[PDB]
Design a protein around this ligand. Sequence first.
Ligand SMILES: Cc1cc(CCCOc2c(Cl)cc(C3=NCCO3)cc2Cl)on1
Lengths: 40, 40, 59, 255, 255, 59, 57, 273
Amino acid sequence: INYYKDAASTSSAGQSLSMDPSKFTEPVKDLMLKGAPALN
Amino acid sequence: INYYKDAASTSSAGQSLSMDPSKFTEPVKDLMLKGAPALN
Amino acid sequence: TKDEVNSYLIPLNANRQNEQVFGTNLFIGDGVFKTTLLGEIVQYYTHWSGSLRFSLMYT
Amino acid sequence: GYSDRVQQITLGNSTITTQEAANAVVCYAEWPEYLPDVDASDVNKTSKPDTSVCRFYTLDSKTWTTGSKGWCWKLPDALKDMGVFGQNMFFHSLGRSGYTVHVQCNATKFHSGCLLVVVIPEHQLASHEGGNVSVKYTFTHPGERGIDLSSANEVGGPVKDVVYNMNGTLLGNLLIFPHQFINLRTNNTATIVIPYINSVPIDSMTRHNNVSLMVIPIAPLTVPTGATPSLPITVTIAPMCTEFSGIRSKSIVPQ
Amino acid sequence: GYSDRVQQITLGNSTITTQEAANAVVCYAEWPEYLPDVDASDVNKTSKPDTSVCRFYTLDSKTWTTGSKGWCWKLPDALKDMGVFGQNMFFHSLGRSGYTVHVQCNATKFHSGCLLVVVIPEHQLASHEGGNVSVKYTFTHPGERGIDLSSANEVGGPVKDVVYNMNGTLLGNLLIFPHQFINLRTNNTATIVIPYINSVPIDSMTRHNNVSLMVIPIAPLTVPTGATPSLPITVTIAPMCTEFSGIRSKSIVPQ
Amino acid sequence: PDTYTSAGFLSCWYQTSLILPPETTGQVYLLSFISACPDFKLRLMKDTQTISQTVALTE
Amino acid sequence: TVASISSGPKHTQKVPILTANETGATMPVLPSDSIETRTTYMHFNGSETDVECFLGR
Amino acid sequence: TVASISSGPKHTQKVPILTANETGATMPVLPSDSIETRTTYMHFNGSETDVECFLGRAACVHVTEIQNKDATGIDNHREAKLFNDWKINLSSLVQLRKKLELFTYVRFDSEYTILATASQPDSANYSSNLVVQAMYVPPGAPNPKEWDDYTWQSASNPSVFFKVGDTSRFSVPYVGLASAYNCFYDGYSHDDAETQYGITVLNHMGSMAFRIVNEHDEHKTLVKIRVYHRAKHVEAWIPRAPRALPYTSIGRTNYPKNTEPVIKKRKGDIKSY
Ligand SMILES: Cc1cc(CCCOc2c(Cl)cc(C3=NCCO3)cc2Cl)on1
């Protein structure tokens, strides 16, 4: 129950439960498959 | 939920969301169209 | 040097060519703008965004 | 017979071929794109010179020697004088751009050495004076020359200490930024595609640089016996999806 | 309440209003348009800076006095230094453009005078020397200053005799070219839209001017009694549908 | 007024020049107005530097 | 809501920027009447300028 | 969810453990690519590492102090701490600072808690009960000159009145100019040759001003204000390398000269355990 009118006044947000490290761990242009050779 | 009986005791009103500047910006008797000459 | 009806009047000179009529920065909360209704209301808020309409009427 | 290894990038009227690449990085897995209306604020129609600005400019070459500490360029600064890209830059109030960065360094199968090529969004430098000394404008706008981390402290300039990234963080952790290594034994180029990254939809190109490109020797250069002890490093960079807006008189900037 | 008389032209980030126009001429009844593929030859994709080059540049003002003979500007020369239009010009090998020309001269209902405003495609000037003396480059590239037909013959310059149009034809017949009069009693501006007219699809912007704009007093200026005896004439011109192609190093031209 | 946040300048020049009819003389004036376009946004209310006081008023 | 619509070159007999202020009106002129604009949205409602809000603290 | 699958002997032409780090990727290698594993489940979600959780607890961001005393003959209230201010900023204290600077841009609503406690360091008959007044002077607002000015009227300025010893709490929407707060800014206000450098030029959101409403009693009372800040509704972009050297200034990245080696030297060889 929100007792207040504005959105800033609500409690903390709830877990992204998004999670996708590939923008950080695999930003390569041509896709690399694990097990296939790195450099062909 | 109002806890009180009288109307003065309720919280602030809620946004007019009315908004019509023409009584102030265009109080002319004969309607002016933008693009048409001001004085004919 | 003292407020006068005359500071509302931008003068124009006949026969000058190429020259400059007036100049101002656009700090709507200060300077020329500051006493205008726009300037005067803007001052009740911290941030502004939007387009301004500046018009000149010739007399 | 496609290898990760050979590549061609054609952009505008200029083409680059590498026969010894190591894939390419696209920052944060996003490719440069123009500014959508839903994200727009300034009401001005923007100018998109296209092929006259989105081509490859090769900056002047550096020389890696056994004593090198590393070099740093800022964008869009490094290009402030390249062809029509630069003119547009000084002439509009606002502009926006992504880039393709291609760093080149070839040697032979007897050399060793490894450079880190990294792009740091919003690289705010530190004053070597400490306290709250600022870093003057000119110092953070070296132009095509870039900053040479093995040059001496100057007054009003930034600190040039490598193991601290010019900001109080350790060299070792720069790997959290989009980056690629050039290991003479593997690699001969590094290519990074940079999407436009800012907290505003479009900004000024002269008062704010939005990425520093940094090339840092990490495993020292080691040449074969009686080889000349140095290799040149060349940086070629191409603006991509550039847009300029708010045209007028032409900025005048310090120094 | 639309009159032939009042008009607004908005082009790029610049707008012109006239409250005393006399219609507008569109050369040969054609409006500027880009270069179609069917007409193309150079294989290069062209650059269309759009709003950064297609805006209104106001050249410096002239002064019509009772002794004036007339002035002449060449295009694209007159604009060789205006903003990004000019940069593009020196930086590409080829370019192409149409223009909107707006000539301004206001007075009062007591003045008299009438100017001819005409656009001449391929206005090859004559040497005042006669014979086969040429007219040097600099002389036919006056820039924003234009040529002042009441200035003196100079060496290597063109002839400036008005009743011969600077080429061996009579002033009276200039009316076969797109033109408009400014008659103080009627008119206060002249506007002509110029489509790109050439025998090749795109050309060099520096070695060849494709139109001369000419403003010539024909009925002498006559001011009311004890009025100052002169009026300024201002020329504002806007490139329209401009395209540049074959970008490179940046032309260096005489003088 | 703030730098980072600054908005530009506004200037005005003779394009050709003012010309007065006979029997007329001197300066003419322009009046200038300012208002906001429908575009405009103002936010984060605060107190105006345009009014202050040193003791409470009385009747 | 659009804050600005897209608008391009104009060469008309219809001039929205010339008016007669003597009439007492403020004609609703916009950026797109005198320069070439691109679409942009308002993203804003004018909530905090409502008179209830202005006098309500 | 499985944390590890079962995997047995391998004799392949397909080697997942050989890679080329020069590419910039961190290949997702697992225990089961190089040893024989058994199934095990995760039993865990990663709840407490969510950025909302990481930045979502109150941190002390500021400690100031004001006193209640007779202002008679004080020529400079501000200077007597008859009332203080704090040109708002979250770079002051470094505990919360390091956490925030793990990201480049950050966007969130703030919840402030303000604790005020009183001290009476010299002989008093009693402890008085004071009421504090915290008012946020938005930039371009009349700055309190005195302690009972006309500014304190704060008729358009959000202000809160609470008792010393007690706590005040509220929340503020994200009042950033841009789409997010810039944790770092490699630019200037304008193209000047002497203009400052950093964010200290970007983060100019006025200051908060405190004061004691109560007049003065016979003794003097020191009131010390602690402001706590909790981010709610957090959004963070572009991770960066953590801060290694100590901080010297609000808003610049500068570290102190002749600082000490931050990497611990081995007591022994590279070979040492
Ligand atoms: C980063 C960052 C975040 C902030 C906070 C902005 C200022 O927020 C406040 C506002 Cl809008 C109001 C009040 C306040 N109103 C009544 C009492 O306090 C206090 C603060 Cl810190 O500043 N830098």
